[PDB]
């Protein structure tokens, strides 16, 4: 499982904010989210379905 971000440099030229740390954090939260949802689905269905 993964998360990926590509950014045209020409936009980082004219930006007027950071977006680095924010991007990183969002990737991490995406990871954790995927894990939790996957698990819950698995127990719920796979145990009793």
């Amino acid at each position: 499982l993964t998360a990926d971000v590509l950014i045209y440099d020409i936009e980082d030229a004219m930006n007027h904010y950071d977006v680095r740390s924010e991007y990183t954090s969002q990737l991490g939260e995406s990871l954790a989210m995927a894990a939790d949802g996957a698990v819950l689905a698995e127990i719920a269905g796979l145990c009793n379905v």
Binding site: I10, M14, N15, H16
Partner: protein, 49 residues
């Protein structure tokens, strides 16, 4: 020219012009006549890389 600017997307410059210099006949009003000053800018947008 060549005047340089960082940060944002596009650039623009303000301009203005002339004046009207009139005598003030003593014992009269300074608020009597003002045609003020015209105000407009010209805009320039960069092209990608």
């Amino acid at each position: 020219m060549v005047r340089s600017i960082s940060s944002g997307k596009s650039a623009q410059f303000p301009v203005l012009g002339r004046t009207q210099a009139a005598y003030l006949a003593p014992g009269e009003n300074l608020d009597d006549k003002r045609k003020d000053i015209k105000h407009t800018e010209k805009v320039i947008t960069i092209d990608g890389l």
